[PDB]
Ligand binder design. Structure first.
Ligand SMILES: COc1ccc(-c2ccc(C(=O)N[C@H](CO)C(C)(C)C)cc2C(=O)O)c(C(=O)Nc2cccc(C(N)=O)c2)n1
Ligand SMILES: [Ca+2]
Lengths: 55, 254
């Protein structure tokens, strides 16, 4: 599943036995209840630009 | 950087400036509060290991605006496979003496997982390259941080599109080509070690390190970047390890 369009994950994808897929996030982010999206848990998460985020 | 634009202040917040005895050496990329990724070749000619400084939140080299944060480089870690004076395995991992403070102007770039980088990031066409390097081949360096958008090529396509020169280095699996063959846009001397950053679903990731080229923006040639995905596991293992005495450390690769 992870091989095709990142398995629908916003960030990291882990393939499991059968038709199972688990999306994961970098540190400073948590996975939303949709099981695909990553939301920041810190003020300065990696790879986001504060002056662009704030406007 | 040749043929780019000024990176608006704070829009390249993971960009690092490396200094030796206060003089411009290379670029780097902040990947968390203590660790910087740069190019191994930047350290080939260092004797004064104690005078190596990393500057975060830098923009304009002519003025101090208070967003700059300077840190001594405690350690420079190079793969055992890197050979000084050559181009292969061109990566260095740098431990800062004290963490930088994250602010609107100092933010790390995400170091991605290997599979995500190889399966997804490697197919994102355009990425940003940045630095205070020469604005032209045999020209002056920039006072303001510069940024350039570059397309990535498959290595077969890079070799097919490139002019033969003789005694030129090979493009290995530890590198990739990016840029333009029309002599207009490229990374240049002094940009070495800086980020090749790739956007994916609202977040930026580290995919390449400015490494080398056959002159800046030379017709028939592309920029060569260290393929960071080959080093994810190597970097992660080192970041989970305790510091060792001595500034330079050679670590086994793989
Ligand atoms: C691989 O080993 C090495 C070893 C040394 C160099 C290299 C040689 C000389 C200079 C240089 O002139 N440095 C200056 C201070 O001495 C300054 C920083 C430009 C002010 C800078 C580099 C550099 O690292 O950027 C280079 C290099 O020039 N790399 C590079 C980076 C980006 C584009 C190009 C290009 N297309 O020509 C070349 N590569
Ligand atoms: Ca400044």
């Amino acid at each position: 599943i992870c091989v095709n369009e990142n398995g629908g994950c916003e960030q990291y994808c882990s393939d499991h036995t059968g038709t199972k897929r688990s999306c994961r996030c970098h540190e400073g982010y948590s996975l939303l209840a949709d099981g695909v999206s990553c939301t920041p848990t810190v003020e300065y998460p990696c790879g986001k630009i504060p002056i662009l985020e704030k406007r | 950087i040749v043929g780019g634009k000024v990176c608006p202040k704070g829009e390249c917040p993971w960009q690092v400036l490396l200094l030796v005895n206060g003089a411009q050496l290379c670029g780097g990329t902040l990947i968390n509060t203590i660790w910087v990724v740069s190019a191994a070749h930047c350290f080939d000619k260092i004797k004064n290991w104690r005078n190596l400084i990393a500057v975060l939140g830098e923009h304009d080299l002519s003025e101090h605006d208070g967003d700059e944060q300077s840190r001594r480089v405690a350690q420079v870690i190079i793969p055992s496979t890197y050979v000084p004076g050559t181009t292969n395995h061109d990566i260095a991992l740098l431990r800062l003496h004290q963490p930088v403070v994250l602010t609107d102007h100092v933010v790390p770039l995400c170091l991605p997982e290997r599979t995500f980088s190889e399966r997804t990031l490697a197919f994102v066409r355009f990425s940003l390259v940045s630095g205070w390097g020469q604005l032209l081949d045999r020209g002056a360096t920039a006072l303001e941080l510069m940024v350039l958008n570059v397309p990535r090529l498959m290595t077969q396509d890079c070799l097919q599109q490139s002019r033969k020169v003789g005694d030129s280095p090979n493009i290995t699996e530890y590198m990739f080509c990016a840029g333009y063959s029309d002599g207009s846009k490229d990374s240049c001397k002094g940009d070495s070690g800086g980020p090749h950053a790739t956007h994916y679903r609202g977040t930026w990731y580290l995919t390449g390190i400015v490494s080398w080229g056959q002159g800046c923006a030379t017709v028939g040639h592309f920029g060569v970047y260290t393929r960071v995905s080959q080093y994810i596991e190597w970097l992660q293992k080192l970041m989970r390890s305790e510091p060792r005495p001595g500034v330079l450390l050679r670590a086994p690769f793989p």
